[PDB]
Design an enzyme around this catalytic site. Structure first.
Site, mmCIF file in Angstrom:
data_model
loop_
_atom_site.group_PDB
_atom_site.id
_atom_site.type_symbol
_atom_site.label_atom_id
_atom_site.label_comp_id
_atom_site.label_asym_id
_atom_site.label_seq_id
_atom_site.Cartn_x
_atom_site.Cartn_y
_atom_site.Cartn_z
ATOM 1 C CG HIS A 173 -3.703 -27.037 -23.411
ATOM 2 N ND1 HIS A 173 -2.794 -26.409 -22.451
ATOM 3 C CD2 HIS A 173 -4.299 -27.839 -23.048
ATOM 4 C CE1 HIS A 173 -3.449 -26.795 -21.360
ATOM 5 N NE2 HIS A 173 -4.214 -27.681 -21.485
ATOM 6 C CB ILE A 219 -3.818 -26.220 -15.220
ATOM 7 C CG1 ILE A 219 -3.452 -27.827 -14.797
ATOM 8 C CG2 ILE A 219 -5.386 -26.448 -15.158
ATOM 9 C CD1 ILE A 219 -1.792 -27.441 -14.140
ATOM 10 C CG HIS A 278 -6.920 -31.554 -22.202
ATOM 11 N ND1 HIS A 278 -5.849 -31.811 -21.794
ATOM 12 C CD2 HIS A 278 -7.200 -30.338 -21.719
ATOM 13 C CE1 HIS A 278 -5.494 -31.081 -20.873
ATOM 14 N NE2 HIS A 278 -6.087 -29.742 -20.873
ATOM 15 C CG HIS A 330 -8.980 -25.861 -20.357
ATOM 16 N ND1 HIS A 330 -8.593 -25.163 -19.254
ATOM 17 C CD2 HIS A 330 -7.962 -26.707 -20.683
ATOM 18 C CE1 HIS A 330 -7.478 -26.055 -18.717
ATOM 19 N NE2 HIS A 330 -7.064 -26.771 -19.731
HETATM 20 FE FE LIG Z 1 -5.280 -28.314 -19.415
#
Ligand SMILES: [Fe+3]
Length: 835
Positions: free
Chosen positions: A501, A835, A496, A687
């Site tokens: 990100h 997010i 993740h 994601h």
């Molecule tokens: Fe996230």
């Protein structure tokens, strides 16, 4: 003259301002009038004597148009009137100056009554501050799509100079109204001046890391190579606002670390009102069942909190509770069955870590000089007693033997992790077998640790085998528990945080600095960049920082984000592509007679089947969009801005790996399409699959534990006997305790929720993003091709043969499915990493 009628749509600050939303004959639109917003048109057709398109006379907003065109909720319409010296030419841009104290959100402008021409649209969607806070005037452009060469000669000064505005000069402390996109290293995580310094990640080969948006704050007194804590700057239009306070998910997290987590700490460690430990599995469950009883004084502080109201129900006012994590229809599984422990490796929270074995025993690629031998101590004989007649060589050749191998990821950090005060973990290896019904079966779980020196036999390895009956089933359950602490650690930091990100924000910064608003490949990719620089910023400030939420909740602790750097050394851009990912892990064999040109080794591998249909759909769309604008590899070779963008994405963005052979060029049509597909696959589907299933499966701390606090109990010892006597205290004693469990459940719940708005893959913020009817038509084919895929998710999920698609938790794997609604859904693929 023959006066061009103009229409401006805007939104005041406060309809998008959280604080003003939560509140911390009559006429208001009447004040954005007179000498308050002026505008000048720029000509795409006529020029001055230096060759640059004409600018034409500063004219202030005329009237508040009261009627709805259609507008959009809190949008206010207005007309400006521009004259016509004929010889001005058709307008392809405008300059706007606001003379008011406060900013507004300009959303559009349309131009009517241009004699001989039709209505000129502009898609603005940008915060316009008082001029005096801007370097030079804002320029908004027409929705037409142009490569660099194809830009109107009048609009080239304008196109190429607005870039220079976006890049800035690499100096100064950035302000919130600024739109300068640039790069820095992750040197803003620790607080050295206060005793908690972290290593500077990036700008080194010992500490490689993707670079991030430069903030420019003052230095640390102790380390003037690290920057001070303060509030994180993100370039102004990267902070997306909202009507509805429940949708500022960043405010929900900011308030988690600030308001709430300290009250839970007061509650456990001030007077112990609720204990720090759990005593049984019913206790952990009585949080989404009855709830955790906290005193009325702690509840009455959380109950008003304007951004945490969707995340728990505080009310009952003696109790804080909820939500039921989707691992509940069956409460006895998740937390327990062997077939679900194995099912989640292919359809769980972390589905793309699992290899296929090709030799036995399993190996290590670690470095024998630094870590010793490290080879798996699991024997033919341990596997085979559960392989149902199959020999390991039979299963090796029939591609039935698989693995989840966390040896080489953990062993480098386990001396350091195990010497942290409340940690005692292992580096695990779990063999999985593919049964005849197409299900995975755990055969053995190996557990290692270096023991002291750490380049010799250190590994100290044990093997734990499956068991249903007795004490041996409790030692298996505690072995599976250590495996999932490694897995949760890895998923957060690597599957993740890094592979979505951190790795994206390089391309997001590169796109804004080198591809104009006018550029084909800016229009394609920009949806996939929405709110990524913004959650990353908050994450660098409140989640990823020293003594923050990821370090408190996950095993490596202070070594977390540094772990994703060691793992970043091994990140390969071209391997982020799902067929290439799948093929490299042994889970796909390259096949021409077959489906997505690959034959799947585990055919009911739900993620890879999400994957491949959303992969081909993304790739067919990028292939058709690119093919509209680049007729030849020479057009991909000739784009002055695409070369620049890509030269920088690599060399400054992913600078610490710029030298790798695997990095693509931008010399062909196929190289553009696949770089763009990987970036579009990462931001949307990768994601989704590793983010939205977080509170669904990790909502039960028994299923996905995050911290591991004791080794396997030693025989003929007091803590072994308590494992025979009360097995669920021996478990709960091993995993995340009560405070850490309420920090965990609480952020992964906020992070698993979709906002009201969100914009999902086949969607776009506005319908007129391009004036290309063909680009718009191939985008509606893309949208239509994704609703078809939803349709085949729902039937494979309704197909009883595909066991892994539901399993014992009876949870239809729907993390594949584009459509979803607010929140808590276990469905939905956003456009971005939001997010
Ligand atoms: Fe996230």
């Amino acid at each position: 003259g023959q006066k061009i009628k103009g229409t401006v749509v805007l939104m005041p600050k406060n309809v998008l301002d959280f604080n003003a939303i939560t509140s911390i004959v009559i006429d208001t639109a009447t004040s954005f009038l007179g000498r308050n917003i002026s505008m000048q048109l720029i000509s795409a057709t006529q020029t001055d004597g230096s060759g640059n398109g004409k600018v034409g006379k500063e004219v202030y907003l005329e009237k508040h148009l009261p009627t709805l065109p259609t507008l959009g909720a809190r949008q206010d319409a207005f007309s400006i009137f521009f004259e016509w010296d004929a010889s001005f030419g058709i307008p392809g841009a405008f300059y706007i100056k606001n003379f008011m104290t406060d900013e507004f959100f300009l959303v559009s402008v349309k131009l009517e009554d241009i004699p001989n021409h039709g209505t000129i649209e502009f898609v603005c969607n940008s915060w316009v501050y008082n001029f005096r806070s801007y370097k030079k005037n804002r320029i908004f452009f027409v929705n037409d799509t142009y490569l660099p060469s194809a830009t109107p000669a009048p609009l080239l000064k304008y196109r190429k100079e607005e870039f220079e505005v976006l890049r800035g000069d690499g100096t100064g402390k950035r302000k919130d109204f600024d739109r300068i996109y640039d790069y820095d290293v992750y040197n803003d995580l620790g607080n050295p001046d206060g005793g908690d310094p972290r290593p500077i990640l990036g700008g080194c080969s010992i500490y490689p890391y993707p670079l991030r948006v430069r903030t420019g704050r003052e230095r640390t007194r102790t380390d003037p190579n690290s920057e001070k804590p303060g509030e994180v700057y993100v370039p102004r239009d990267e902070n997306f606002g909202h009507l509805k306070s429940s949708d500022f998910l960043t405010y929900g997290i900011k308030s988690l670390s600030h308001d709430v987590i300290p009250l839970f700490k007061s509650a456990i460690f001030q007077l112990r009102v609720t204990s720090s430990e759990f005593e049984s599995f019913e206790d952990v469950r009585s949080l989404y069942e009855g709830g955790i009883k906290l005193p009325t004084d702690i509840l009455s502080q959380i109950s008003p909190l304007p951004a945490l109201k969707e995340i728990f129900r505080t009310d009952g006012e003696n109790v804080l509770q909820f939500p039921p994590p989707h691992v509940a229809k069956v409460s006895k599984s998740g937390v327990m069955t062997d077939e679900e422990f194995a099912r989640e490796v292919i359809a769980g929270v972390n589905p793309n870590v699992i290899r296929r074995l090709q030799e036995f025993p399993p190996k290590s690629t670690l470095d024998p000089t630094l870590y010793g031998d490290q080879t798996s101590t699991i024997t033919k004989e341990q596997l085979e007693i559960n392989m149902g007649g199959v020999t390991v060589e039979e299963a090796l050749s029939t591609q039935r033997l698989f693995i989840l191998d966390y040896q080489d990821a953990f062993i480098p950090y386990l001396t350091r992790i195990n010497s942290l005060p409340t940690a005692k973990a292992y580096a695990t290896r779990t063999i999985l077998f593919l049964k005849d019904d197409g299900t995975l079966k755990p055969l053995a779980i190996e557990l290692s640790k270096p023991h002291p020196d750490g380049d010799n036999l250190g590994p100290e390895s044990i093997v734990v085998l499956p068991a249903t009956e007795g004490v041996d089933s409790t030692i298996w359950l505690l072995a599976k528990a250590h495996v999932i602490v490694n897995d949760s650690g890895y998923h957060q930091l690597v599957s993740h945080w890094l592979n979505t990100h951190a790795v994206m924000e390089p391309f997001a910064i590169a796109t804004n600095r080198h591809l104009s608003v006018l550029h084909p490949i800016y229009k394609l990719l920009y949806p996939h960049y929405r709110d990524t620089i913004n959650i990353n910023g908050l994450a660098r400030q409140s989640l990823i920082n020293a003594d923050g939420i990821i370090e408190k909740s996950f095993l490596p602790g202070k070594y977390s984000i540094e772990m994703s750097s060691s793992v970043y050394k091994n990140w390969v851009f071209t391997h982020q592509a799902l067929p290439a990912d799948l093929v490299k892990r042994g889970l796909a064999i390259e096949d021409p007679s077959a489906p997505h040109g690959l034959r799947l080794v585990i055919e009911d591998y739900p993620y890879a089947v999400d994957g491949l249909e959303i992969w081909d759909a993304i790739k067919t769309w990028v292939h058709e969009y690119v093919s509209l604008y680049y007729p030849t590899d020479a057009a991909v070779q000739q784009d002055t801005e695409l070369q620049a963008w890509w030269k920088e994405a690599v060399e400054k963005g992913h600078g610490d790996l710029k030298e790798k052979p695997w990095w693509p060029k931008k010399q062909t049509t196929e190289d553009l399409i696949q770089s763009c597909s990987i970036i579009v696959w990462t931001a949307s589907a990768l994601h989704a699959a590793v983010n939205f299933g977080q509170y669904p499966y990790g909502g039960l701390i028994l299923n996905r534990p995050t911290l591991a606090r004791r080794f396997i109990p030693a025989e003929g010892t007091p803590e072994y006997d308590e494992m025979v006597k009360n097995p669920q205290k021996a478990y709960l004693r091993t995993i995340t305790p009560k405070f850490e469990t309420l920090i965990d459940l609480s952020v992964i719940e906020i992070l698993s929720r979709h906002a009201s708005d969100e914009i999902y893959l086949g969607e776009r913020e506005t319908p007129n993003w391009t004036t290309d009817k063909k680009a718009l038509e191939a985008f509606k084919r893309f949208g239509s091709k994704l609703t078809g895929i939803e349709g085949k998710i729902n039937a494979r999920n309704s197909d009883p043969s595909l066991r892994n698609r539901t399993g014992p938790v009876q949870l239809p794997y729907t993390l594949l499915h584009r459509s979803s609604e607010e929140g808590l859904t276990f469905k939905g693929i956003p456009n971005s990493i939001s997010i």
